[PDB]
Design a protein around this ligand. Structure first.
Ligand SMILES: O=C(O)CNC(=O)Cc1ccc(O)c([N+](=O)[O-])c1
Length: 236
């Protein structure tokens, strides 16, 4: 399954912009349970929509989402200068998430207009590791009841886009891995320290990338809050 978005769109402050997201099946359906997330510079992600149409609490009213004409659509009614960002949609395909390629939204024109965090996920900024070794990545959640949400892990590099690695449910113990990462990643959690861990084993040069944790929950706003990302460098 391949998820397609407009590569770029240009708007101005005060205009209404629609961003679209199509499935290679020919239709985005309700069970794809779509999230929309926004990336700003220094790979700073925020979730905007979950469950196809639910605006995440705290997200401004100018954002809305729904399924229309066999696609998923995010609408910004009255774009603001600060909405310049990369917007990604994420679709659930029964046992894995797939991200679109992202839409770079440029907002050109008069700044200064528009309408104006409990949850934090803390990740170390960087890790350096040698080939053939393993590395542990950590993600400490604060400001919510940590075991009651799942933790997703996602990776990003330019050219490859965003790739979902897997998720862990602290209260059930159930873990899902994407097929691409099933032998590379191991997910664990420690409830007393409110920390989720990802081990990457048998490191190679191909593993250098940014690795994020992001909260999720069945039927709720997947990818609502994200860590800042850990940049892993595998030495030569
Ligand atoms: O269809 C609905 O009402 C709710 N759907 C969802 O929340 C999407 C979903 C479902 C199962 C599952 O195991 C994962 N996951 O991320 O592992 C995500």
């Amino acid at each position: 399954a391949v998820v397609t978005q407009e590569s770029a769109l240009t708007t101005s402050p005060g205009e209404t912009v629609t961003l679209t997201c199509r499935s290679s099946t020919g239709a985005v359906i309700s069970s794809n349970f779509v999230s929309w997330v926004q990336e700003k510079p220094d790979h700073l992600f925020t979730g905007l929509i979950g469950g196809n149409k639910n605006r995440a609490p705290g997200v401004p009213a100018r954002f809305s989402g729904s399924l229309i004409g066999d696609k998923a659509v995010l609408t910004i009614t009255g774009a603001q200068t600060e909405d310049e960002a990369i917007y990604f949609c994420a679709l659930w395909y029964s046992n894995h998430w797939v991200f679109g390629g992202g839409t770079k939204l440029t907002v050109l024109g008069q700044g200064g207009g528009g309408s104006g965090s409990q949850v934090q996920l803390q990740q170390p900024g960087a890790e350096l590791a040698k080939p053939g070794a393993s590395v542990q990545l950590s993600c400490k959640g604060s400001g919510y009841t940590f075991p009651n949400y799942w933790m997703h892990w996602v990776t990003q590099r330019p050219g490859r886009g965003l790739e979902w690695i897997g998720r862990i449910d602290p209260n059930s113990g159930f873990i899902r891995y994407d097929e691409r990462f099933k032998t590379k990643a191991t997910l664990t959690v420690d409830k007393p320290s409110s920390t989720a861990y990802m081990q990457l084993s048998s490191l190679t040069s191909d593993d250098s990338a940014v690795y994020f944790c992001a909260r999720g929950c069945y039927g709720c706003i997947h990818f609502d809050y994200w860590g800042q990302g850990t940049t892993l460098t595998v030495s030569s």
